[PDB]
Amino acid sequence: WVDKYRPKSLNALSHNEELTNFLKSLSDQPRDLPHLLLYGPNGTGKKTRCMALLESIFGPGVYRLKIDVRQFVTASNRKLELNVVSSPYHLEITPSDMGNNDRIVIQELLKEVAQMERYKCVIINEANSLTKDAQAALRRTMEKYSKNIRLIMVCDSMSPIIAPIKSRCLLIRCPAPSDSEISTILSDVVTNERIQLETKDILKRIAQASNGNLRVSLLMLESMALNNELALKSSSPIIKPDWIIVIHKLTRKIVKERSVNSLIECRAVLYDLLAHCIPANIILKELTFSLLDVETLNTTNKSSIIEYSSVFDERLSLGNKAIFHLEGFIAKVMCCLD
Amino acid sequence: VREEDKLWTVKYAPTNLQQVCGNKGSVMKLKNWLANWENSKKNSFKHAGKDGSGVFRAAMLYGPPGIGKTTAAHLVAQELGYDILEQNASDVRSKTLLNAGVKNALDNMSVVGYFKHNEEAQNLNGKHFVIIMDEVDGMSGGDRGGVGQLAQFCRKTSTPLILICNERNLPKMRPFDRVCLDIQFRRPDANSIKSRLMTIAIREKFKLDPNVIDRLIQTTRGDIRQVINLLSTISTSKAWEKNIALKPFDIAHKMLDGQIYSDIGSRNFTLNDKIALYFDDFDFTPLMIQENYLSTRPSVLKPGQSHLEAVAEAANCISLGDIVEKKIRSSEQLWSLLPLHAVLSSVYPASKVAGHMAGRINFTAWLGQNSKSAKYYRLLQEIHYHTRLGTSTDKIGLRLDYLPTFRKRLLDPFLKQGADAISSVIEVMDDYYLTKEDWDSIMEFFVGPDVTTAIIKKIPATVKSGFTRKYNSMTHP
Amino acid sequence: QLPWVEKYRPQVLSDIVGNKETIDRLQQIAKDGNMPHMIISGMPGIGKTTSVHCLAHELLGRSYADGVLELNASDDRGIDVVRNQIKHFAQKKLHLPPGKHKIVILDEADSMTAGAQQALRRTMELYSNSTRFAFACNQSNKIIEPLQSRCAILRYSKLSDEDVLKRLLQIIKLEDVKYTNDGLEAIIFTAEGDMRQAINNLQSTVAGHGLVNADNVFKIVDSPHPLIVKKMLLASNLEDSIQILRTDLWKKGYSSIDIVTTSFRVTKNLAQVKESVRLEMIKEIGLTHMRILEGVGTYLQLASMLAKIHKLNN
Amino acid sequence: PWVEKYRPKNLDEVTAQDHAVTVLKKTLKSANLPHMLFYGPPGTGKTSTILALTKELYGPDLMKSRILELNASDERGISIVREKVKNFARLTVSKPSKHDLENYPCPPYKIIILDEADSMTADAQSALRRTMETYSGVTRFCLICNYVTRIIDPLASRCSKFRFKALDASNAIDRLRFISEQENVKCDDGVLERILDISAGDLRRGITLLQSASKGAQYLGDGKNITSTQVEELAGVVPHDILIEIVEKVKSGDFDEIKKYVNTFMKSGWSAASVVNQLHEYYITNDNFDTNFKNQISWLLFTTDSRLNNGTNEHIQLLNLLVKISQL
Amino acid sequence: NLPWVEKYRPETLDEVYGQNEVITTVRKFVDEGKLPHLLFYGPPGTGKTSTIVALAREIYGKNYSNMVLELNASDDRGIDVVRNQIKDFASTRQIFSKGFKLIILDEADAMTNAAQNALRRVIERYTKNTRFCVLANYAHKLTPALLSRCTRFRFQPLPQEAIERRIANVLVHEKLKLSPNAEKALIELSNGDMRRVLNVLQSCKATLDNPDEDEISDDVIYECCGAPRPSDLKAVLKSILEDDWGTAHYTLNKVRSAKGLALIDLIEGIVKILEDYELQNEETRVHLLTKLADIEYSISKGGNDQIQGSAVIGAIKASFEN
Ligand SMILES: Nc1ncnc2c1ncn2[C@@H]1O[C@H](COP(=O)(O)OP(=O)(O)OP(O)(O)=S)[C@@H](O)[C@H]1O
Ligand SMILES: Nc1ncnc2c1ncn2[C@@H]1O[C@H](COP(=O)(O)OP(=O)(O)OP(O)(O)=S)[C@@H](O)[C@H]1O
Ligand SMILES: Nc1ncnc2c1ncn2[C@@H]1O[C@H](COP(=O)(O)OP(=O)(O)OP(O)(O)=S)[C@@H](O)[C@H]1O
Ligand SMILES: Nc1ncnc2c1ncn2[C@@H]1O[C@H](COP(=O)(O)OP(=O)(O)OP(O)(O)=S)[C@@H](O)[C@H]1O
Ligand SMILES: Nc1ncnc2c1ncn2[C@@H]1O[C@H](COP(=O)(O)OP(=O)(O)O)[C@@H](O)[C@H]1O
Ligand SMILES: [Mg+2]
Ligand SMILES: [Mg+2]
Ligand SMILES: [Mg+2]
Ligand SMILES: [Mg+2]
């Protein structure tokens, strides 16, 4: 559904006319394209911009790409593998499957691709999960090979990137789509999908409740179209994912009851949420913002909430067993709210 | 030669296929595959008969250690009357040595199987081979070219080739991706292990408290050989389970006592003694303290500090101790930090929230949750490895956003459209390279108001059979 | 000369002092003979190797030279060894009493490579009728899970104070040494459970200063003096503590790690202050230690540690 | 490009950095150059100075003959220091021809430049100790580190220490004016010093920002002087108007208004957390606050920056910082 | 031609300074002939290596090239090296050797726990045919067993008299003049490591040898060492404690820029200065020490320099308010 209405060119883009104009400007120099560092919130379509730029420079056949697996041996006697999706002109490295061996794989793969000889494109996904050693190796690779490897790295909140890397690449940002433009894209979607709308207020409602995240907005429109039989009326009970509802029920249990007898069940809910492929930082952010949204608290309680949330977010980023820090944060929250 | 001087694991080993506790389904699958391997060979391994287990030449066993994989394989091979040619880690399984020794015997026949019994009509497979490659995961650095040669042995073979490993999803075991069938042995449940332990105990003329048996089965984390070996220690009676077997339980009981941290009791039990109590078992003490530090009625509360503040400070110190443990395990040569960790994760929260135990000391559960998280992360990584070609997301945003609507499109038609929507469902399944196992995995990752394990079986089984038989006709890649 | 730790090493199982439960377990094992494969884990110098050696000696009697194979960190333990030599030793015919068995004692099992530990699996599973294995390790986490599960685990707690005191008194009575109670308490302090280190420090004190006295022990240990560190950690005004740490400890070239470790050890034994304040002072000293180990060792860190300790004590 | 086409190949072209280098200028003609350890901020001239020194000392013949350039791109394990570094510290001198001695006096020793030694393991550094002490007469070591506290102190006791001051924010404006006039780029009046200040610490960042701004401006065919807005939009720094909005919101406002505003910011605004730097600058250089306020402001900003250093979430830390600064 | 660090290396037991308490002990050990396994440990630039090489050359004379084996840290140091090389050298008995050999392990604190266990077992095995000598900087990273097996020797830093005598001997044997405050600043900045002194001396020699008669002033010493002058420290502290925020910030910035000052060493000097003030209250000292230690710990991870500078200024100012 969503992927069926994904643009495949800079002209097919229907958002951020400034950004598409600047990319049309940059695509005028296929012989000299500096390194790019795209940064912006999740679901803004930075990968769409990158693939459209690639389609503008190279042929439109860049979108039919094949997956491949590559296994290599490290300095020690461990032989580990990764999966790269490659195209006739570019390859996408995602140093996320591997835990601490980012530097060796990035070094080896870049040095191997940089001896194929008109250049090649390397798309680095999740450029914030790179250890500083891997980042330094990447910068030295950029320093050595500059005529075959033109790096384009997408990321969000580009604080964990050392200034030695920011200097070489062109910093490009992708602001979230405004509610008006989200509503426009939703209207185009429902028009090309002949969805029977009762009014246009549902589109603005979804744009507002989506918090400027384009892809989750489109996906929740998809999810709601299959619950109203393609006839979206004004009485639409907006559908949230399962984990958001679980986190909101946890927030309501925290607010309504403040005791260890409820902290046990809170730890149980945290265990059940974590064991089903959900990060710790996402749970912490959602729980903090949900607790801040509650209207029964004053300003001092909210200040204590945000301070403890910051402290335990730092501790989560420093630790390894997330359940401990999550239980500690919830215990301190229950203490302050008591 | 003596009935007594043998160990309790070898002496009480299974003999038939009804004493193997747990994993009955996998044992029956292996048996029904080995029995029909003959007809599979007759059909040149191209007609998947009724189970999809007729095209594969080699069966692969994997699972946690101490379940019966080796025993199940040997007993299954022996019941059918085959002849077991077994090679294990203790043999040099290099490429040249495998080509020399085993490869020349992939299609030959047995001499001992011939001469043992060939006159009475018992079974016609008394002379065939069943090559068991045990501990293929154990191919160390000294076995070069072994995994690839065994992957090649999976094909082009002429006899049943059973393979045993401990970690299927290890990268080294990748060449066994689709060229062999692979079944999984799960950790047996408490009921079967309890029945087996009761049989052993009454057979050895000694009785135990069932609660102690439950605590044992919990501590050993499902390993049957481990619990049997630990039970054999009873002969050499509260002292046995108090000191040697159930040590972390007693550590937690002593630490969470309220009379120790009192001034009257502290003078008799110094802080050095509590740090030694921690050092008794520095692998399970932190988890045991963190699991049940908030289930006691306290008695050391300050005049103006309720229970909630105490548990909050205890959890804060627990987080600090977790950070210290991570720093320790970042470099073992910093073992000097071990006493500090002792006070942070172990001594401080106990001293902060000590008192009297409300109920019973529950064993730690973080290990099972960690294992479940690892399994689900592996499954999600496989799903993303499949679906990345047409989604344009990361391995974590997938579960966050796409999984609810994917589950809707894949299941909700079965609730309202009945059974004719299969041609549509597979259609969606044909756009994202998903399979039936991928469909199950997608259906699994759901918690909250959208639980699916209850709903899944409500649909008619006829719909399941029709969907399975209709997916078998087409293939997307 | 001759080291006391080597001269007075227990050869009979009964002479071992320390853990009372596992030593009686091994006593009954030697009394019966049906010994299973066993890993022995615990902290250094608490009687692991001597225990298994005495067990093998008492179990096999006159056939120890022919029915025991020992492998420590010095001998080569790779893939070829575990495949050829251990396997040819397990199969070796040997007629022993009905209950006894050949013993393979692997000391420092942690250094054995995981790939090398793989080969031992079937070798010890198949020939369990005439061969038993005894691993001796410090940390039972570096042993692979199969070997971890095949054998019985035997944990050795760190030595208490009364046991080390009894052993040291036995050694003194056997050696006719002049001593005093404060000297023995200083030995217990500088040992913290290490029987080997306790005996060696005792012998070094006796050889160097003749009489076992507090100042002699604290001059031969080369560690910061416990009394002066206690005075530092218990001074009323902060400037006194800072001056003590500056002039009496920092000038004489002591390593910051040693200062923090000595402060930790003395704060553990301050049986005059309350228990909660002791725990909080230990928390502060441990945070300072963790800061020191991360690469920074400036005097300012120890100054801040003393400042926070005083702030807590006020 | 421009950053490399106008790179200084001699130590005289550099004007901001002339304190540490001078002693080498005194001892270049001799063979007793001590083992050197450069430290300081990135983009300072360390690589430029070492390459210029190799150009003025060796020549095109021996530039790659007895010099070993190792970076984080190359294998940084113990394998390299065992196999190739130890072998090259011992190898003899090579003299191929006579066109080198005409312009450059060749010393009998050699130079190896092991860069990015900051992230090296302790065992590797203990091996460096041996390979530097055993061939201290025939081989010299050049080390580069951004943080001195990571590299172990026994090594710094052996190798001499050299710091390269980040940048000179007073005279480098003339250098950038020279670059602009030779490149014929038409920039505004108050943009050059702005380009320099926003690129504090580095100069390579300054010249690459100038290049990017020029290549972005010349596309429009506007022919007008490029103002500071186009530079601040490409440097990733927060604009001043949204900053005034932020500071007015946090100066007087409840929790809910601040929360909604930081939500809007982290949603659609400039996604970086460098707004803490701008807030610190504005609150420190201002003259409308008493001292007891500025003390707590500096402490809170330092705490927020130290927390953000650990790669934590941006939104939570920014909201906490703004809420705590609003509480005063 | 060779550097002074390699040239002025002692060759006899008499040419070592400030270590008499250990020199008399090693002379007793060499005249007795009962030389056991030794452990030499202490801060760098003290003379452990020089002392042990001189002792070996004295005991074995010309046989030093045969009965003395020197090994360093991480020479492909798996367990295999300790199994082959050290074990052969220890076990093998020479053709015409009387007594015992000597194996000196330099910087031997970088050994893993397994390597140290192998080494302790080896030294236990062949303790009758050879003696070992282990050198270390930190005696807390060694297994207590190996420590207990040998006799310890801590190398206290060189006192002022020893370093002054050594620099005098270097001065009379070279063409250099040294001003009275020069040696004072030298001893204050070196902290007692002879290697750094012998390095900085030849450095400032080659630096200011223009007329072969220039005097080494404190400016050139502070430049070559890269350490601030106490006057600048007093001035910046005065500006912080007296002036307002903007002027103090500009002063700190210019002082740390025009001279190249790191916040770490600046904070070290500032707390050294504040250590001797007559503070009337106590909470000021506590807050000052705590905040400054926090600043140093945060700097250890490389944050934003200007933010840590402003935080230093704020801590120093808000501490002095009582
Ligand atoms: N289901 C079972 N019921 C009873 N005893 C069992 C069972 N499974 C294993 N055992 C015991 O374990 C012994 C054999 O161990 P196995 O479980 O077969 O080893 P494994 O399954 O190959 O696991 P490894 O080799 O450590 S990876 C038997 O002799 C029994 O003592
Ligand atoms: N309980 C004890 N009774 C008497 N002597 C003991 C005791 N524990 C240790 N020792 C002494 O400590 C010395 C060291 O030997 P072990 O204790 O066997 O060393 P270890 O326990 O194996 O520790 P390692 O080798 O560092 S892992 C022995 O020779 C004994 O003299
Ligand atoms: N002082 C300087 N004068 C003139 N150009 C300079 C100066 N410093 C740097 N550059 C320019 O920046 C580039 C050289 O910078 P580098 O020497 O690599 O900086 P850096 O500090 O060594 O970065 P590192 O060490 O690799 S992180 C060349 O393009 C030079 O033209
Ligand atoms: N006590 C001393 N008396 C005279 N010169 C000394 C003394 N200590 C060091 N030196 C000089 O400094 C040089 C270095 O001495 P080393 O013995 O290498 O120092 P070190 O004790 O080995 O410390 P390391 O090697 O950094 S751990 C010697 O070659 C001498 O020139
Ligand atoms: N201009 C646009 N017009 C229509 N859809 C868009 C546009 N930009 C982005 N999208 C949609 O946003 C979705 C998510 O973008 P993506 O790049 O996957 O976000 P992320 O960077 O989080 O992976 C895409 O599926 C795409 O269809
Ligand atoms: Mg098995
Ligand atoms: Mg031992
Ligand atoms: Mg550089
Ligand atoms: Mg030395």
| C17 known member of a binding site | yes
Amino acid at A39: Y
**Rounded to the nearest whole angstrom, what is the distance from the C-alpha of residue C12 to the centroid of ligand 2?**
14
Query: Are E246 and D294 an interchain contact pair (Cβ–Cβ within 8 Å)?
Result: no
Which positions in chain B touch A271 (Cβ < 8 Å)? 365, 369
Query: Are D130 and E137 an interchain contact pair (Cβ–Cβ within 8 Å)?
Result: no
Residues 327-356 of B with CB under 8 A from E: 332-333, 336
Tally Cβ neighbours within 10 Å of residue B465: 11
CA dist E194 → D35, D276, E158, E190 (Å): 17, 45, 8, 8
Query: Distance from E114 to chain C by nearest Cα, in Å?
Result: 5
Q: Which residues of D67-102 are buried (b: 16+ CB within 10 A; e: fewer)?
A: bbbbbbbbbbbbebbeeebbebbeeeeeeeeeebee
**Rounded to the nearest whole angstrom, what is the distance from the C-alpha of residue C11 to the centroid of ligand 7?**
15
CA dist E319 → B368, D292, E24 (Å): 51, 11, 51
Structure tokens at B263: 């001034």
Are E94 and E68 a contacting pair, CB within 8 Å?
no
Which positions in chain D touch A139 (Cβ < 8 Å)? 72
Q: Which chain B residue's Cα is nearest to A271?
A: B369
Q: Which chains touch E (3 or more CB pairs under 8 A)?
A: B, C, D
Structure tokens at A336: 């302050």
CATH of domain A179-232: 1.10.8.60
Question: Measuring CA to CA, which residue among E177, E187, E252, E185 is closest to residue E214?
Answer: E177
- Sheet with C102-107: strands ordered across: C68-71, C102-107, C131-137, C38-42, C152-156
Number of independent structural domains in chain D: 3
Q: Are D251 and D213 within one domain?
A: no
Query: Are D150 and C296 an interchain contact pair (Cβ–Cβ within 8 Å)?
Result: no
Question: Measuring CA to CA, which residue among E271, E253, E256 is closest to residue E316?
Answer: E271
For the stretch C178-187, contacts whose Cβ atoms lie closer than 8 Å and that sit 24 or more positions apart, written own/partner, are C178/C210, C178/C211, C178/C212, C179/C211, C179/C212, C180/C211, C180/C212, C180/C213, C182/C213, C182/C214, C183/C211, C183/C212, C183/C213, C183/C214, C183/C216, C183/C217, C184/C212, C186/C214, C186/C217, C186/C218, C186/C226, C187/C212, C187/C217
Give dist(CA A138, CA A165) in Å, integer: 9
Q: Are D127 and D249 within one domain?
A: no
**Rounded to the nearest whole angstrom, what is the distance from the C-alpha of residue A2 to the centroid of ligand 5?**
8
Q: Which residues of E252-281 are buried (b: 16+ CB within 10 A; e: fewer)?
A: beebbeebbbbbbebbbbbbeebeeeeeee
Q: Which CATH class is domain A2-173?
A: alpha beta
How distant is the alpha carbon of residue B466 from its chain centre? Answer: 32
Q: Which atom of ligand 4 is nearest to the CA of E16?
A: 3
From atom 31 of ligand 4, which residue's Cα is the shortest distance away? Answer: E9
Structure tokens at E139: 């005696």
**Largest CA-CA distance found in chain B, in angstroms, rounded:** 89
Please provide the DSSP assignment of E31-61 as one string.
Answer: HH-----EEEE-SSSSSHHHHHHHHHHHHHG
Are C84 and C67 a contacting pair, CB within 8 Å?
no
- Sheet with E101-105: strands ordered across: E68-71, E101-105, E130-136, E38-41, E151-154
Q: Options 1.10.286.10, 3.40.1260.10, 1.20.272.10, 3.90.25.10; which CATH number does A242-337 get?
A: 1.20.272.10
How distant is the alpha carbon of residue A59 from its chain centre? Answer: 27
Question: What is the residue range of D232's domain?
Answer: 168-237
Residues 55-114 of B with CB under 8 A from A: none
**Rounded to the nearest whole angstrom, what is the distance from the C-alpha of residue C194 to the centroid of ligand 2?**
8
Q: Please enumerate in sequence order all residues whose Cβ is within 8 A of that of E64, keeping only pairs 6 or more positions apart, or say none.
A: E56, E57
Q: Are D158 and D175 within one domain?
A: no
Q: Are D65 and D97 within one domain?
A: yes
B225 lines ligand 1 (CB under 6 A): yes
Which protein residues touch ligand 5 with a CB less than 6 Å away? A 2-3, 5-7, 13-15, 42-48, 185, 214-215; B 392-393
Structure tokens at B42: 């007759």
Query: Are E113 and B336 an interchain contact pair (Cβ–Cβ within 8 Å)?
Result: no
End-to-end CA distance of chain A: 47
Beta strand spans in chain D (E): 36-39, 67-70, 110-114, 139-145, 160-163
**Rounded to the nearest whole angstrom, what is the distance from the C-alpha of residue C137 to the centroid of ligand 7?**
8
**Largest CA-CA distance found in chain A, in angstroms, rounded:** 68
Please provide the DSSP assignment of C228-258 as one string.
Answer: HHHHHHH-SSHHHHHHHIIIIIITTT--HHH
Query: Are A277 and B445 an interchain contact pair (Cβ–Cβ within 8 Å)?
Result: yes
The answer to whether E24 faces chain B, any CB pair under 8 Å, is no
Give dist(CA C285, CA C302) in Å, integer: 9
Strands D160-163 and D36-39: parallel
Task: Count CA atoms closer than 13 A to C39's CA, side-chain side.
Answer: 25
Query: Are D314 and A159 an interchain contact pair (Cβ–Cβ within 8 Å)?
Result: yes
Inter-helix orientation angle A322-337/A260-274, to 10°: 150
To what resolution in angstroms was this structure determined?
4.0
Q: Please enumerate in sequence order all residues whose Cβ is within 8 A of that of A204, keeping only pairs 6 or more positions apart, or say none.
A: A179, A183
Q: Which chain E residue's Cα is nearest to C255?
A: E138
Nearest CB to C300 within list E42, E118, E289: E289
Q: Output phi, psi for C133, to 5 deg.
A: -115, 140
Starting from the CA of residue C149, give the closest ligand: 1
Q: Which chains touch B (3 or more CB pairs under 8 A)?
A: A, C, E
**Rounded to the nearest whole angstrom, what is the distance from the C-alpha of residue E46 to the centroid of ligand 4?**
5
Nearest CB to C264 within list B4, B226, B339: B339
Q: Are D115 and D216 within one domain?
A: no
Torsional sign, CA E242, E244, E249, E255:
negative
Give dist(CA B399, CA B382) in Å, integer: 12
How distant is the alpha carbon of residue E163 from its chain centre? Answer: 13
Beta strand spans in A194-292 (E): 196-197, 231-232
Method: cryo-EM
Are A325 and A312 a contacting pair, CB within 8 Å?
yes
Beta strand spans in B276-331 (E): 296-298
Strands B58-62 and B161-164: parallel
Query: Distance from A146 to chain B by nearest Cα, in Å?
Result: 27
Give dist(CA D188, CA D225) in Å, integer: 5
Best probe residue, ligand 3, of D6, D36, D204, D210 (max atoms within 8 Å of C-beta): D204
Query: Distance from D29 to chain A by nearest Cα, in Å?
Result: 31
CA dist B124 → B17, B117, D281 (Å): 21, 11, 90
E5 lines ligand 4 (CB under 6 A): yes
CA dist B214 → A267, B208, B239, E29 (Å): 24, 11, 17, 64
Annotated domain spans of chain A: 2-173, 179-232, 242-337
From atom 29 of ligand 4, which residue's Cα is the shortest distance away? Answer: E9
Question: Measuring CA to CA, which residue among E231, E161, E163 is closest to residue E200?
Answer: E163
